[PDB]
Amino acid sequence: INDNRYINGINQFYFSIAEGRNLTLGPLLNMPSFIPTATTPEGCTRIPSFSLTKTHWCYTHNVILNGCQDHVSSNQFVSMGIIEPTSAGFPFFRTLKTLYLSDGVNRKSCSISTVPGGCMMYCFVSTQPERDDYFSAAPPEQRIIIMYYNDTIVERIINPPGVLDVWATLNPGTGSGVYYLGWVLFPIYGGVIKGTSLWNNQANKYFIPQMVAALCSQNQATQVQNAKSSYYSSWFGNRMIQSGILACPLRQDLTNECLVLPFSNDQVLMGAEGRLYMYGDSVYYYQRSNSWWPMTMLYKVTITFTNGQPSAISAQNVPTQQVPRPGTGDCSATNRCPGFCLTGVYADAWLLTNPSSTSTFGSEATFTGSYLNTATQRINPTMYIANNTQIISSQQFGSSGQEAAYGHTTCFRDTGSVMVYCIYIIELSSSLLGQFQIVPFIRQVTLS
């Protein structure tokens, strides 16, 4: 279990709106990395997923032996441990167990989540190129593995209702899931078949961020028309790219009890990878900007239960225009107009301030994370702290041109020293060992 210095400083809004204005990054601190490195120049470690809870943390990433492509074989590294203070005062992520799922099943795009006594991971079995998954009417196999600290492992192939013949594909969002009221929630996304109830109920819906108007040159009618078309991809089997949540009751005999809950396309953009968070009793969702709007998308999720079962989710967006991401073509970090896009990178963000503490939801929100500071290339990894319209603190890592990819940010507080630390797990391109080196950068978020 985590040290007493951290058990009460996890999953919360650490700063008040007033304090949020005086936050700055501190120097990076050196700690023994708990994320394994590749041992060959061509080895590939990618797609991390991290979850920190009151008692412990869970971590996982995918491993490919040669290069970063391979839809036949890959292994998945899983790790778990706790946080304890060092003599210097800052955190040390103590790994207490390790697992390497290597058995022939090609588990991909996995999302992990902390659960009482262990970790619950959700993956889908890949057997062909991503694009082919969208064209095939049958969805890939879905699995959820529960790994207890007592070394018991239980993997189950799940068949949640409303998936077969509705979704051509279904993928975990790779971002961490969360344990909520006895259920494990995971972010999901995929392609929905034309003519299905979901497709019809989603017909004509669209979402346009609150700050797009002042930045977009098109008129309201044109924006609306383009926005509506952005949820359909001809490149990905003519499916409706959908975002949602997978709710699974914590059980060791899961079969069809998990529930697929799609977001209304009136509150969310085109489906993409994502992450779920817990700030106090409120659930939040991060949605990768893989569509036309290149800015960080965070939403407060309201979950509705009907007979002890999650029955519907509602999302409220924290309106911002900060922290863009590299994109291709007319969907670069500079784009501001609705239309169909299918490019971007995963770069979640953590809310250092409560969006509900302001009379108007998210009128003044502060968040931290990393982002690739460029218009179209996955280059220049840069850790930052930002508000709705500006970056108020940032430090680029390495020299310009430094390649990088995904970034997962998580913050917690030392209730002893009373400081906030954030860990920025970034996929860095390495020249020595492996294609990428996933680094758990850690530094303090100083108030002043």
Ligand X SMILES: *[C@H]1O[C@H](CO)[C@@H](O)[C@H](O)[C@H]1NC(C)=O
Ligand Y SMILES: *[C@@H]1O[C@H](CO)[C@@H](O[C@@H]2O[C@H](CO)[C@@H](O)[C@H](O)[C@H]2NC(C)=O)[C@H](O)[C@H]1NC(C)=O
Number of residues that bind ligand X (CB under 6 A): 3
CA–CA distance, 381 with 398 (Å, rounded to integer): 8
CA–CA distance, 216 with 338 (Å, rounded to integer): 8
Q: Using the rule CB under 8 A, is 442 a contact of its own copies? A: yes
Number of residues that bind ligand Y (CB under 6 A): 11
Q: Using the rule CB under 6 A, is 148 a contact of ligand Y? A: yes
178-180/183-192 β-pairing = antiparallel
Q: Scan residues 364-393 and list those touching its own copies (CB under 8 A).
A: none
Q: Using the rule CB under 6 A, is 390 a contact of ligand Y? A: yes
Residue keyed to tokens 């961020």: 209
Q: Using the rule CB under 5 A, is 168 a contact of Ca ion? A: yes
Q: Using the rule CB under 8 A, is 150 a contact of its own copies? A: no
User: Cβ of residue 350: shortest distance to ligand X, in angstroms?
Assistant: 20
Backbone angles phi, psi at 226, to 5 degrees: -70, -40
- DSSP secondary structure of 34-100: -SPPPSSSS-EEEEEEEEE-SS-EEEEEEEESSSS--SS--EEEEEEEEEEE-TTSSEEEEEEEEEE
User: Cβ of residue 389: shortest distance to its own copies, in angstroms?
Assistant: 29
Q: Scan residues 59-88 and list those touching its own copies (CB under 8 A).
A: 63, 65-66, 72-73, 75, 77, 81, 84, 86-88
Q: Using the rule CB under 6 A, is 364 a contact of ligand Y? A: yes
User: Cβ of residue 22: shortest distance to ligand Y, in angstroms?
Assistant: 9
CA–CA distance, 224 with 338 (Å, rounded to integer): 8
- Cβ(291)–Cβ(330) below 8 Å: no
Q: Using the rule CB under 6 A, is 388 a contact of ligand Y? A: yes
Residue 7's binding partner among its own copies, ligand X, ligand Y, none (Cβ under 5 to 8 angstroms by kind) is: its own copies
Where does this chain touch ligand X (CB under 6 A) — which range of 15-23, 111-119, 227-235, 277-285? 15-23
Residue 387's binding partner among Ca ion, ligand X, ligand Y, none (Cβ under 5 to 8 angstroms by kind) is: ligand Y
Residue 133's binding partner among Ca ion, its own copies, ligand X, none (Cβ under 5 to 8 angstroms by kind) is: Ca ion
Q: Using the rule CB under 6 A, is 22 a contact of ligand X? A: yes
- Cβ(119)–Cβ(101) below 8 Å: no
Q: Using the rule CB under 6 A, is 392 a contact of ligand Y? A: yes
Which residue number places its CB atom closest to ligand X? 22
- Cβ(189)–Cβ(244) below 8 Å: yes
Task: Classify 131 as helix, strand or coil.
Answer: helix
Quick one: 193 or 349, whose CB is closer to Ca ion? 193
Quick one: 24 or 238, whose CB is closer to ligand X? 24
Among the listed residues 195, 214, 432, 448, the single contact to its own copies using CB under 8 A:
432
CA–CA distance, 286 with 324 (Å, rounded to integer): 14
- Here the tokens at position 137 are 């009417």
User: Cβ of residue 34: shortest distance to its own copies, in angstroms?
Assistant: 7
Backbone angles phi, psi at 299, to 5 degrees: -135, 145
Bridge-partner residues for 81, per DSSP? 57, 95
Q: Using the rule CB under 6 A, is 417 a contact of ligand X? A: no
- 398-405 long-range contacts (CB < 8 A, ≥24 apart) are 398/428, 402/428, 402/429, 403/378, 403/379, 403/428, 403/429, 404/372, 404/378, 404/379, 404/380, 404/428, 404/429, 405/46, 405/345, 405/346, 405/372, 405/378, 405/429, 405/436
- Residues lying near Ca ion in the complex (CB under 5 A) are found at 133, 136, 168-169
Interface residues with ligand X (CB under 6 A) are: 18-19, 22
Footprint of its own copies (CB under 8 A)? 3-9, 28-43, 45, 63, 65-66, 72-73, 75, 77, 81, 84, 86-89, 92, 94-100, 102-106, 125, 127, 398, 413-418, 428, 430-434, 437, 439-442
